[PDB]
Amino acid sequence: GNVVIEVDMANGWRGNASGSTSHSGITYSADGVTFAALGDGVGAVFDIARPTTLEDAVIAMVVNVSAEFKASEANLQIFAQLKEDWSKGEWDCLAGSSELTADTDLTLTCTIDEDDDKFNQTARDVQVGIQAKGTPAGTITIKSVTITLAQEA
Ligand SMILES: O[C@@H]1[C@@H](O)[C@H](O[C@@H]2CO[C@@H](O[C@@H]3CO[C@@H](O[C@@H]4CO[C@@H](O[C@@H]5CO[C@@H](O)[C@H](O)[C@H]5O)[C@H](O)[C@H]4O)[C@H](O)[C@H]3O)[C@H](O)[C@H]2O)OC[C@H]1O
Numbered sequence: 001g002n003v004v005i006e007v008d009m010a011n012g013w014r015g016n017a018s019g020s021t022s023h024s025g026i027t028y029s030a031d032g033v034t035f036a037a038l039g040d041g042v043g044a045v046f047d048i049a050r051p052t053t054l055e056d057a058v059i060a061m062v063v064n065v066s067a068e069f070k071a072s073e074a075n076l077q078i079f080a081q082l083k084e085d086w087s088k089g090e091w092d093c094l095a096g097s098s099e100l101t102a103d104t105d106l107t108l109t110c111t112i113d114e115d116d117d118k119f120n121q122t123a124r125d126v127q128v129g130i131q132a133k134g135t136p137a138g139t140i141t142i143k144s145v146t147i148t149l150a151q152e153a
């Protein structure tokens with residue numbers, strides 16, 4: 001089959017802010033990575049080390065969303081972007097509030113597919129993560145992230 005990358009859930013993560021609200025970092029636990037969903041654009045990220053062949057790759061995240069997050073009606077966006085060339089990215093993935101629940105774990109997926117093949121490249125690390133969108137509250141826990149490339153292993 002294809003190349004499968006299993007992301008380390010005990011090292012290498014950071015809080016992230018892509019909007020007008022500052023983040024409060026991340027917290028590691030036996031269950032994975034958790035962040036406080038303080039506002040629109042607040043999330044959690046890690047880096048895929050260069051070089052990358054990420055076009056047509058599938059990102060799958062197992063997550064748990066808190067009751068307060070579900071009540072806030074905010075959405076969840078898996079995204080990826082070129083580190084230090086931030087506007088160049090994959091911005092078309094979204095899980096809306098209506099499809100989330102606080103009652104069980106969920107698997108959210110995102111396919112990277114850019115018309116200019118920006119994600120097949122050697123120059124930059126790629127920042128990948130998940131962020132809240134809208135007017136959020138509560139917390140988000142990431143248990144695992146698995147990336148399946150469009151390349152034979
Ligand atoms: O359909 C089209 C859509 O594709 C389009 O979506 C918009 C795409 O652009 C999005 O905005 C980007 C969000 O992410 C930002 O990156 C931030 C930059 O800041 C970084 O944090 C810095 C890290 O470095 C430190 O030194 C510094 O202290 C920190 O501030 C952070 O890690 C990145 O995530 C990009 O800069 C933005 O361009 C936008 O939200 C989408 O709506 O919309 C148009 C539509 O036609």
Ligand code: NA
Pocket residue numbers: 064065066067101102103104
């Ligand atoms: Na929950």
